[PDB]
Ligand binder design. Structure first.
Ligand code: WW8
Ligand code: WW8
Length: 83
């Protein structure tokens, strides 16, 4: 059960060490979490909060920040970026 991430999401996964074009959603989500850490987008003082307005991840979410505790914007992003 592989999808192909569209370029902007693919760039993001590759930026977290992913290789290739095809992934399971499990992989996608794991690399996304790693990306947030690699790029230090989460707040060390509020570790469920991600400030992504200056990052490609924000453009994809269409949001400047989100909470991993209530991660609503993620779902549509994945629908739009996974073929
Ligand atoms: C600063 N630390 C607190 C981070 C702990 C990270 N941790 C060990 C890993 C284990 C597998 N994880 C994930 O699969 C995971 N994937 C993500 C993908 C996104 Cl877009 C957002 C959050 C997470 C995300 C994730 C996060 C998270 C939080 C801050 C920075 C990076 C990742 N925390 C919990 N999760 C699990 C999760 C998965 C999916 C959703 Cl929708 C929500 C939460 C997190
Ligand atoms: C706007 N268009 C560009 C949309 C075309 C979409 N389409 C034709 C169907 C075909 C069947 N699909 C799914 O089962 C599927 N649909 C979703 C819708 C959303 Cl908002 C989020 C994830 C998935 C989601 C999904 C997938 C996935 C991956 C690749 C291709 C299709 C679907 N993988 C996991 N999910 C669901 C999901 C929901 C929440 C979380 Cl936290 C993680 C995964 C997609």
């Amino acid at each position: 059960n592989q999808v192909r991430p569209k370029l902007p999401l693919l760039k993001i996964l590759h930026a977290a060490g992913a290789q290739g074009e095809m992934f399971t959603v499990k992989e996608v989500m794991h690399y996304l979490g790693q990306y947030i850490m690699v790029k230090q987008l989460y707040d060390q003082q509020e570790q469920h909060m991600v400030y992504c307005g200056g990052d490609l991840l924000g453009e994809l979410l269409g949001r400047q920040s989100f909470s991993v505790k209530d991660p609503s914007p993620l779902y549509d992003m994945l629908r739009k970026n996974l073929v």
